[PDB]
């Protein structure tokens, strides 16, 4: 979805395992 | 987890298709 639709959602950072390996 | 606590354990390599896929 979009961030606006849900209620009580908190800004945070999600980490991806794949990106470090690629670099 | 880490490979210390579990009572019965065996050694084999989890293939992780990812390394092959990136290259
Ligand atoms: C949580 O409850 C407070 C009142 O205690 C209210 O002001 C706030 O908007 C509520 N937040 C959510 C995300 O439901």
Swiss-Prot record, chains A, B:
Glycan-modified residues: 11
Domain of life where this protein originates: Viruses
Task of the protein: Subunit of the fusion protein that is processed upon entry into the host cell. Mediates fusion of the virion and cellular membranes by functioning as a class I viral fusion protein. Contains a viral fusion peptide that is unmasked after S2 cleavage. This cleavage can occur at the cell membrane by host TMPRSS2 or during endocytosis by host CSTL. In either case, this triggers an extensive and irreversible conformational change that leads to fusion of the viral envelope with the cellular cytoplasmic membrane, releasing viral genomic RNA into the host cell cytoplasm.
Protein name: Spike protein S2'
Species of the source: Severe acute respiratory syndrome coronavirus 2 (2019-nCoV)
């Amino acid at each position: 979805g979009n961030c606006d639709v849900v209620i009580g959602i908190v800004n945070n950072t999600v980490y991806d395992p794949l990106q470090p390996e690629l670099d």
